[PDB]
Amino acid sequence: GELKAIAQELKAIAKELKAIAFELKAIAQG
Amino acid sequence: GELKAIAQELKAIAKELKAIAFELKAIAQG
């Protein structure tokens, strides 16, 4: 139901943030 | 239902993070 749908979107938000962290690490390296 | 409304705003937040990751990838490419 709905509480699970909410947790799923939080998952998808963490996933985007991980990709943000990697782009920044690339930038910090060059 | 407001619980569905909450999940939808979270999905929209994920969408914006997706766009942020793309722009940072572009900057890393500099």
Place this chain on the structure above:
Amino acid sequence: GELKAIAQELKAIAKELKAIAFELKAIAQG
């Protein structure tokens, strides 16, 4: 009520993320 207020706050958060994506687009435009 309160679940609505939570959703309205997530929408404001999404709005801020839009502006962040926009400035990042500007910075990418190097």
Place this chain on the structure above:
Amino acid sequence: GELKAIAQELKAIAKELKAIAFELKAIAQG
């Protein structure tokens, strides 16, 4: 109670994101 405390922290998150947007605008300008 608790649902209000949650909305309050979402407020404080949006506030930090607004300050992030302004720092990025400054960077996009110079």
Place this chain on the structure above:
Amino acid sequence: GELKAIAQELKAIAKELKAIAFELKAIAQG
């Protein structure tokens, strides 16, 4: 209660955004 636990994680997320805003302010100072 898990609702208190949720508010606490949100506060911790706000703390991290605070640190992100500081570092960006430092970069804007370049």
Place this chain on the structure above:
Amino acid sequence: GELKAIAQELKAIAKELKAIAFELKAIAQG
């Protein structure tokens, strides 16, 4: 249960934001 899963996802999100703050600190170190 489900509210716990929501909180555990917010904690993972906080963890990603820590790494973002760290890379930004590195970039600030210009």
